[PDB]
Design a protein around this ligand. Structure first.
Ligand code: UMP
Ligand code: UMP
Ligand code: UMP
Lengths: 112, 112, 112
């Protein structure tokens, strides 16, 4: 397992931490949503939650990443939920497929 | 009408407030985007706006929730915009389909 | 080029800054993701990043906007990544297709 702290930012201005799949995977439209492994695990920095989003270049190549919420205290593996939209998409190991964005977790009075 | 304050968080670490449809609905891919009723209404806590996102397990079962922005001062019913991606999806009353995430509303000088 | 500061908010409570395409474009499902030009350019306010999301009415009409992250220091043109989901979608110049939401850029110790 590797923690979120091992992720790298592409540029100091980059909002997202880059996520790659640990496996080579081929996706076709008829397969529907697939969960790609990243080898990266929660949990997140105190008072933050995580949002998995696609990268634009990848989206433009026909791979849709479904927005995923990562809870602050999730300790499992961060997976990228993805689907080939129109064509056959091939994800090579180490292609940066998605990005993790950290956001403030707002405290509310909602019953747990 | 029920307010956002009646929503529950699944776990103290959960970023999102769970949203269910008030109706049993069946969705097929050819139907395209559908707005599912929740019976939950804005408005939101001061200085926040809302983001509707899917839950991972639901997404993986073939129900896409389209990211929806809920304005701070929206007083209508919060609906979940959803589409079956590949197969026939059946949403039973009370299945938690989506989640509402609260985010800080940043003030800017943009003209209203 | 027009800066983000020229965008307007629909209502004081509106979380998002409205985005239109500068061109009339027709989209069919088989075209897959398309990048629509807005004529609006980064960069963003200090300590913020941007999220491009769809508007609900547009989504309901069959135009999917893929969530896009705009980095704080991006100085290029903000484009909307879009796809017609089921039917032929026609985007007239000046239709407000998407919205830009500004979010806090959280500082982390991740290696750049
Ligand atoms: O794209 C996603 C979405 C969720 N999760 C993990 C982190 C979440 O905290 C956990 C539970 O997600 P839900 O089923 O409640 O959405 O699943 C992911 O790894 N990737
Ligand atoms: O998934 C969504 C998106 C929007 N709205 C409501 C709240 C928004 O403030 C309002 C207007 O949305 P737009 O058409 O401007 O996106 O619609 C929803 O109920 N669900
Ligand atoms: O919907 C989008 C997503 C991205 N970008 C621009 C701003 C980003 O900073 C830049 C790089 O995006 P990525 O390829 O790294 O996601 O592209 C857009 O104009 N629209």
């Amino acid at each position: 397992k590797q923690p979120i702290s091992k992720l790298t930012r592409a540029t100091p201005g980059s909002a997202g931490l880059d996520l790659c799949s640990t496996s080579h995977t081929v996706l076709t439209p008829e397969m529907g949503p697939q969960a790609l492994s990243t080898g990266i695990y929660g949990p997140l920095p105190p008072n933050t939650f995580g949002l998995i989003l696609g990268r634009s270049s990848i989206t433009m190549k026909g791979l849709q990443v479904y927005p995923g919420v990562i809870d602050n205290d999730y300790t499992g593996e961060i997976k990228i939920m993805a689907k080939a939209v129109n064509n056959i998409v091939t994800v090579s190991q180490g292609n940066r497929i998605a990005q993790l964005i950290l956001l403030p977790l707002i405290e509310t009075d909602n019953k747990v």
